[PDB]
Amino acid sequence: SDVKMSLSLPDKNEQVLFCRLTDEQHKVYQNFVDSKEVYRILNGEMQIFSGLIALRKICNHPDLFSGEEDQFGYWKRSGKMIVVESLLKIWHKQGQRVLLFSQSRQMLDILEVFLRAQKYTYLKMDGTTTIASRQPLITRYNEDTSIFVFLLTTRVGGLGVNLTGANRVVIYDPDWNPSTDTQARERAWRIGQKKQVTVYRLLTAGTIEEKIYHRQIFKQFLTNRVLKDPKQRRFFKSNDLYELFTLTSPDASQSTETSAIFAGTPLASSSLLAKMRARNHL
């Protein structure tokens, strides 16, 4: 903000798409949130962490949790993959270049198989690639235009690997850390970025992913309150933010939970005493 006038910065826009669950995916999610496993989680007899991983897998794609046109990872069975279909098609018709981010490497491979089912040229870099060959791939993506979509997880590579030739970026699934998603969006939009970059975060409304995004915003708010300004308008509820084993998918009659929450948008011993009493009345 203060140093902006010294260096240039292209404008950045960002949207949070709320992707409805497919009916089979919705049934699987509801069966899991009604199955005895989440009941044992609520009893504390089992680790809640496995249930979290399971629901994140469900919202990514049922084939992860469950395990022609019926092969592994068919994109028609998860709504987020429907939106990725639409966005990838439109962006390819626009001639832009895409970064495809996802925290899960298994769903990253599912997305690869999906891209192969389509005719999009692409390049993948993840943790399985050798580090000594990471720099070439990035360069080959950045120098030409004959590669369309580059596949990442949010946490691979050195911090801020130079992916500049990309124009659009989609974060397939939110993470618990706000910083990894902020780094994901920052990686495309760095110094020396030629064109306006936009980030699309893919969420499933009423699911675990919406609560992951809510936690991400809450942590970001905490960091901002500590680091830039304490006075801050309060957004959240203690019980709603922490309870994250329910399913209330919107029917479009009522607005989504995020929009409902974001509905509005030497000292002379007298200065010393004045400051002490000021701080104490608060």
């Binding site: 011993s269 010393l272 701080r279």
Partner: protein, 365 residues
Amino acid sequence: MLGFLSARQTGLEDPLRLRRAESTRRVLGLELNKDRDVERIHGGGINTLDIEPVEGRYMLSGGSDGVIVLYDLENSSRQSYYTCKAVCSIGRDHPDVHRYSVETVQWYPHDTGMFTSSSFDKTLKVWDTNTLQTADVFNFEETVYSHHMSPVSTKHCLVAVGTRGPKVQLCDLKSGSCSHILQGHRQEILAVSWSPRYDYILATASADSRVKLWDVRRASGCLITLDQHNGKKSQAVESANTAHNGKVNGLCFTSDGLHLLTVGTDNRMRLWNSSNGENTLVNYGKVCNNSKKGLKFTVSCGCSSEFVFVPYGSTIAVYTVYSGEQITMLKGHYKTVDCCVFQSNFQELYSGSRDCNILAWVPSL
């Protein structure tokens, strides 16, 4: 005295000569003035006294009964006999009065409008003298033995607080941060004293027989650990480098801040080079203290030779700092003397004691 007056009048001697010599003579002639009294207000023993640094008119006093008394030390009556009346008092009915013994009380340096006081109720309260109300309270996890504000720092307004914890708490009265801790002691810190010379030098004495000098700016521990022997008994520093052979319950920088006086429950007082912590090997004889808490003792200021007034049982032992020669013992109390404070303007002493009295010692003639 007539030779001194003539030498001042004729310019043979600097007037500094007459000031320092006559002040020294008055201190040597210091004696219990029954021609002056301090109004008895404490129901318990006085643990601490503090005369304000500017104008030296008002004095604070904190008792074991948890009350604070604010006295006027000026003879506002026209008689030669007067009682130092109690101007104000945090009594048993004040809503902010300390629940337990007030162990230390200190005027805010640079101005008389604020003073801070610490107690065994695990609080350091900051009081506005004018309203006589607390402006801030610093709660600590364990009982406070001593607090001290730097008499010299125009920049920082930290209060060094020594409690039973092994850590020294630094509380910033400028916007409130009581998180900073100086770690390196192993037992209760019984005394803390900022150097009058350096804004950021703090000497802390603890029941682990060690005195450490810290540079509170520094992030790497104590500058120096006082050593009785200076290297004759040298060991990898894990248990050696003790300032005393018992608990060190009292600290006092000399007037210029170039030396440090520490008194410990080994019945010794030692004088240390405050720059390199080297023992000066001043003898002082045997200085009887068996105090289980901090022992507040003072030095003289603005005399030809510096003096130290140390509580010696029920008496106040007066010694020459740089030679160790015991000048005298001021004997007027009935129980152990806990604190003495020096009025440098007139070479007067005030001593509190467990007999719930504050005795003024004035120079005779």
